[PDB]
């Protein structure tokens, strides 16, 4: 399990630690989309932070079931529900909470359990692509993981009205990789 920088948006040097955690607050109304991202271990974005992601880079192909775990780090007094839904490859990000509610989803009550782990049934970087003039064995299997505020963030006087969450990912034991491919932006300088 490595920390998945889902919140890969701030770049300002001193806010880089912020990429590790995204937040939830009272201000967010029921149904609102909290966050979203794809199940693309090797491609740019969130997965680059995970160790899995970095290792996928030294390989050309791969496939297996993944597994993301969410950790609520808010005050102990807070409670509420988050809907976490997975839209297989092809299925477009669900319009709203209710439509996402019909897909493979999980209601998460961080009032009961501080952690929850989602399994991504399958992802396969096998479909070849020869775009520009540089051939890249790409995904297309961009499975999607959406997260909606099933209920709002509830808290008693005395507790902060914001809390963060941490994404941790890894692959199941059925994971595999093929074709050693050394590639890197970081190299030994002269």
């Amino acid at each position, epitope marked *: 399990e490595t920390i998945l920088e889902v919140n890969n*948006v*701030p*770049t*300002n040097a001193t*806010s880089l630690m912020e990429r590790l955690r995204f937040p939830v*607050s009272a*201000q*967010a*109304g*029921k149904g*609102e989309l909290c966050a979203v991202f794809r199940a693309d271990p090797g491609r740019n974005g969130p997965w680059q932070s995970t160790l899995l992601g970095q290792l996928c880079g030294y390989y050309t192909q791969w496939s297996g079931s993944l597994e993301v775990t969410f950790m609520f780090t808010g005050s102990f007094m807070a409670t509420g529900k988050m809907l976490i839904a997975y839209t297989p490859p092809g299925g477009p990000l669900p319009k709203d909470r209710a439509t996402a509610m019909l897909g493979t989803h999980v209601i998460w009550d961080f009032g009961l359990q501080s952690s929850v782990t989602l399994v991504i049934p399958w992802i396969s970087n096998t479909h070849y692509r020869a775009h520009a003039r540089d051939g890249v064995f790409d995904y297309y299997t961009t499975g999607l993981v959406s997260i909606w505020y099933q209920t*709002n963030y509830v808290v008693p006087i005395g507790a902060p009205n914001t809390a963060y969450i941490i994404a941790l990912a890894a692959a199941q034991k059925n994971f595999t990789m093929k074709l050693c491919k050394d590639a890197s932006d970081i190299l030994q300088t002269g």
Partner: antibody
Framework: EVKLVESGGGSVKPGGSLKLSCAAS????????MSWVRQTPEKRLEWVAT????????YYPDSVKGRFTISRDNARNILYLQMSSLRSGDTAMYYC??????????????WGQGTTLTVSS | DIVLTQSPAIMSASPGEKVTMTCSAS?????IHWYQQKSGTSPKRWIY???RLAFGVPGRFSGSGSGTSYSLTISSMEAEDAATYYC????????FGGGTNLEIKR
């Protein structure tokens, strides 16, 4: 207290360029998105730009997208708005506003006291 | 390209009676917010998400509306409220309303 106090402006001839700035006080500036709004001689209110909590995204309306550019420097807690190729329709009183998050939408909590821009020959 | 029309533009209450200002939209809208502007001073925050009141606002102010017609209601009216009240929409192009000059009757 939360204070938004802005600076710049005056008379400018049409075609000239100008830069407006707003200074923040008494709230963590980086954690908020910040917008400018203009008021024509005490009647009409028109949104002109927003900036994300960090660098991130900028957003503009279709009356201004092209000439104005909104910026922030999160070391001195200060917004910036440079306006180039200023026109006669740009005369107004410009406020800097803080944008908070609600259940779904956004809302402007505090407004500064504004600077006045008169574009005229 | 989403316009908000406010009626009426000018109003006069006794005071001690109620006041109903209206913000109508050209298309269906999710929520509406309200500001206040007294003379010489900038706009102040008043109502958000249609029915929630900003910390300062007296409890005598109210908010409702659904779809395309929303309204700010005041009961009862007091000489300290006289200002211009603007509505605002947050769905697409962030538009303001024309305002409503609320005034004291004598």
């Amino acid at each position: 207290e939360v204070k938004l106090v802005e600076s710049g402006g005056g008379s400018v001839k049409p075609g000239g360029s100008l830069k407006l700035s707003c200074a923040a006080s008494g709230f963590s500036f980086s954690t908020y998105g910040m917008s400018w709004v203009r008021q024509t001689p005490e009647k009409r209110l028109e949104w002109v730009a927003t900036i994300s909590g960090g660098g991130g995204y900028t957003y503009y309306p279709d009356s201004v997208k092209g000439r104005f550019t909104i910026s922030r420097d999160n070391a001195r807690n200060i917004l910036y708005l440079q306006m180039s190729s200023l026109r006669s329709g740009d005369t107004a009183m410009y406020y800097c506003a803080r944008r908070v998050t609600t259940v779904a939408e956004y809302y402007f909590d505090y407004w500064g006291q504004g600077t006045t821009l008169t574009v005229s020959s | 390209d989403i316009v908000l029309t406010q009626s009426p533009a000018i109003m006069s209450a006794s005071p001690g009676e109620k006041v109903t200002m209206t913000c109508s939209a050209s298309s269906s809208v999710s929520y509406i917010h309200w500001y206040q502007q007294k003379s010489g001073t900038s706009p102040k925050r008043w109502i958000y998400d249609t029915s929630r009141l900003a910390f300062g606002v007296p409890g005598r102010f109210s908010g409702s509306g659904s779809g395309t017609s929303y309204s700010l209601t005041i009961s009862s009216m007091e000489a300290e409220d006289a200002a211009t009240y603007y509505c605002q929409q947050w769905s697409s192009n962030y538009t303001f309303g024309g305002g409503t000059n609320l005034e004291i009757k004598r």
